[PDB]
């Protein structure tokens, strides 16, 4: 997901502005749905929500717009159990042997004969939660096992939290409401208001460990592999309690990253660190936020946001609609030099031409150079020390950069990586004259619709995720609900789309209508006021009631 909030110091109108670009599945339980909710006098919010939820998850009101991105904070901890040497179904806490609780669940299973048979399954549980096994990594032997404690299991506040957000007036009010309830499960919150405040919040439900406990309670090997693993044989490694927290064992709001500014804030699924590099966020628990090198999407955004020039709504919109593959900025120049140093290698001929013709984008008309670039980058990432300028923590926005072609070993592997990537591409059934849009589609009934965008790992702000199905790439997730909000005097001007349309049902008139528009990248008005809604020639109305 991407999110950009712009304040009074940077916006062309001196007012707030927000671009909401979450990246979510195009099917299933997390498929966004547009709606506008009003209880006259005390509620008026519009945006998108998830199936089953009677609140708006991402949206805007009279003076406020907000959105979310998935954070990098941990919302659970693994616990390595020290098993009783006499009994692998018992585990030790403070040297004392405790029994595992066993909960059996019964499942009805339909056979081909259509008969229902009953399957019983035992779920083993510790004081921390259920046991989990990753064969070859997290095993359950006679020495150790692993349990998982999910913080959001006790989060009964999630619905009230979004309902409260739906009622928020401005950025300050939104912040109060979110910090007071701590009901946001696992996302960042970014917002902007008419007054021109831009807010970033890493305010979610995060397991709390007092700072002095961390170096003793962590499992070094596992945390180095990105797992929030703790020592489960020590009672002192239980989540710390702070009466200020809305929930026992979670991190108090005062200790979570917040940035309130009037220039801008952004997030593309990296930590809170470089939300705005002018004011870096540091000094948090590793469970909360770390100073990791940012992904190409954030790096792209910051390259468009840094500076003194006023930001327009059009500028933010085109950050999405341009479909620029930003990772090509770091490697393609030197890759083309390589292609020039190796003319008449024959094996490299098709690839070097395609890469040279390529518009460095993931548009419908983008050439096969994108495909070659993708396969190459998948191999280039597996090479060791091939960046000319490796990551410099003093230059986190401009590094890494370039291919170290002045080192003969590197030049050897990069050319091999290219020849391999080329080989894979020629092998596949890709016709000549094939553009990216001919490849990436979304199926609607018996037809296809070409979809612009590419994988976010390649620095495409308009992130689109697809898998190979038959002759094509079928979109499964990515850019979904788009919302760009400004605050002119009349009221909120909201602009965007729901990329995959309102209905998942092929029989509906709204099964592919917005999808056709997304293909053409033609965003639309999101009507909010009574006058905007009345001005719609497609306006329909129905009043329903029934006895309670």
């Amino acid at each position: 997901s991407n999110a950009i909030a712009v304040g009074s110091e940077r916006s062309a109108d001196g007012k707030g502005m927000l671009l909401a670009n979450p990246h979510f599945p195009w099917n299933g339980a997390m498929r966004f749905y547009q709606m506008h909710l009003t209880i006259p006098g005390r509620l008026d919010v519009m945006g998108a929500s998830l199936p089953g939820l009677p609140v708006v998850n991402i949206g805007f009101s009279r003076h406020l717009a907000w959105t979310h991105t998935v954070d990098t904070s941990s919302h659970f901890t693994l616990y390595r159990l020290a098993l009783d040497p006499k009994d692998p179904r018992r585990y030790l806490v403070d040297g004392r042997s405790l029994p595992l609780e066993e909960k059996s669940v019964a499942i009805e299973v339909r056979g081909a004969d259509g008969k229902l048979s009953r399957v019983e399954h035992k779920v083993y549980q510790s004081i921390y939660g259920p046991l989990v096994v990753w064969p070859g990594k997290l095993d359950w032997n006679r020495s150790e096992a692993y349990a998982l404690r999910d913080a959001n299991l006790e989060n009964t506040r999630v619905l009230q939290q979004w309902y409260s957000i739906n009622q928020a007036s401005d950025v300050a009010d939104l912040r109060r409401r979110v910090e007071a309830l701590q009901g946001i499960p696992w996302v960042n919150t970014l917002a902007a208001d008419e007054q021109g405040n831009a807010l970033y919040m890493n305010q979610s439900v995060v397991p709390y460990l007092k700072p002095e406990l961390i170096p003793a309670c962590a499992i070094p090997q596992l945390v180095a592999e990105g797992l929030p693993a703790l020592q489960g044989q020590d009672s002192r490694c239980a989540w710390s309690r702070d009466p200020a927290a809305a929930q026992a064992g979670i991190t108090p709001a005062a200790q979570l990253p917040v940035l309130l500014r009037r220039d801008f804030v952004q997030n593309s699924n990296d930590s809170a660190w470089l939300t705005n590099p002018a004011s870096p966020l540091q000094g948090f628990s590793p469970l909360v936020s770390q100073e990791k090198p940012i992904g190409p999407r954030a790096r792209y955004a910051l390259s468009r946001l840094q500076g003194k020039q006023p930001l327009e709504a059009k500028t933010l919109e085109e950050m999405v609609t341009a479909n620029h593959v930003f990772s090509a900025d770091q490697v393609l120049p030197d890759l083309l030099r390589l292609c020039r140093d190796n003319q008449g290698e024959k094996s490299l001929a098709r690839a070097c031409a395609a890469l040279a013709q390529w518009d460095r984008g993931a548009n419908l008309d983008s050439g096969s150079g994108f495909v070659y670039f993708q396969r190459f980058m998948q191999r280039f990432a597996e090479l060791d020390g091939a960046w000319k300028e490796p990551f410099d923590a003093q230059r986190p926005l401009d590094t890494p950069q370039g291919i170290a072609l002045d080192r003969p070993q590197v030049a050897t592997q990069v050319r091999q990586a290219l020849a391999d990537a080329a080989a894979e591409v020629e092998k596949s059934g890709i016709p000549d004259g094939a553009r990216w849009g001919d490849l990436q589609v979304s199926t609607r009934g018996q037809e296809r619709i070409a979809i612009p965008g590419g994988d976010g790992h390649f620095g495409v702000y308009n992130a689109i995720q697809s898998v190979r199905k038959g002759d094509h790439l079928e979109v499964v997730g990515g850019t979904s609900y788009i919302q760009l909000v400004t605050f002119p005097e009349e009221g909120p001007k909201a602009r965007g789309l729901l990329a995959f349309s309102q209905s998942s049902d092929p029989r509906s008139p709204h099964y592919r209508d917005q999808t056709e528009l997304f293909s053409r990248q033609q965003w639309q008005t999101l009507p909010f006021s009574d006058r905007q809604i009345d001005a719609d020639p497609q306006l329909q109305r129905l009043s329903i009631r029934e006895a309670a």
Binding site: G28, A29, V133, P185, I544
Partner: protein
């Protein structure tokens, strides 16, 4: 008195729901979403109830690409009656009313649906829903940033035998 909603649709089928309370508001949301996505919600509720194997057998998968039986085991464990009751008791009156309204609105569409925008009419899993079902979906959403990512790992967790 008691469940009532005014609904306006603009271009592309975007619903605009007006009501005097949370109950009426939920009523409109449930009806409108059902008109667009009744089959989707029905399938996902089956998943959250851990009944995929019951309706579809063990060879199939959920929309999250989990085998039906492991998925059913996970969600049966996750959404036990005791868990759902505690969650419900912890809800504010406003939220309870939203959910009650949603369920009633969704169910009203089901009763009157003639297949115009619903491809799964007649299917046994397409049925009236309850507030508990919405709680099951909410909890499923909650654990997506945690134990939900370890659904397969939870199902696979078994004590060692007499090996080596």
């Amino acid at each position: 008195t008691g469940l009532a909603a005014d609904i306006r649709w603009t271009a592309y089928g975007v619903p605009h729901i007006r009501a005097k309370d949370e109950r009426g508001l939920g009523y409109g949301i449930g009806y409108a979403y059902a008109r667009d996505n009744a089959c989707l919600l029905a399938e996902e509720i089956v998943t959250a109830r851990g009944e995929r194997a019951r309706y579809f057998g063990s060879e199939g998968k959920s929309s999250a690409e989990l085998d039906n039986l492991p998925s059913d085991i996970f969600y049966a464990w996750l959404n036990q009656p005791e868990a759902l009751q505690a969650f419900w008791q912890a809800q504010t009156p406003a939220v309870r009313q939203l959910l009650e309204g949603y369920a009633a609105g969704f169910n009203r569409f089901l009763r009157e649906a003639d297949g115009k925008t619903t491809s799964c009419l007649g299917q046994p899993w397409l049925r009236a829903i309850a507030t508990d079902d919405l709680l099951r979906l909410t909890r499923r959403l909650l654990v997506e940033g945690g134990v939900g990512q370890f659904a397969d790992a939870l199902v696979a967790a078994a004590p060692p035998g007499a090996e080596k």
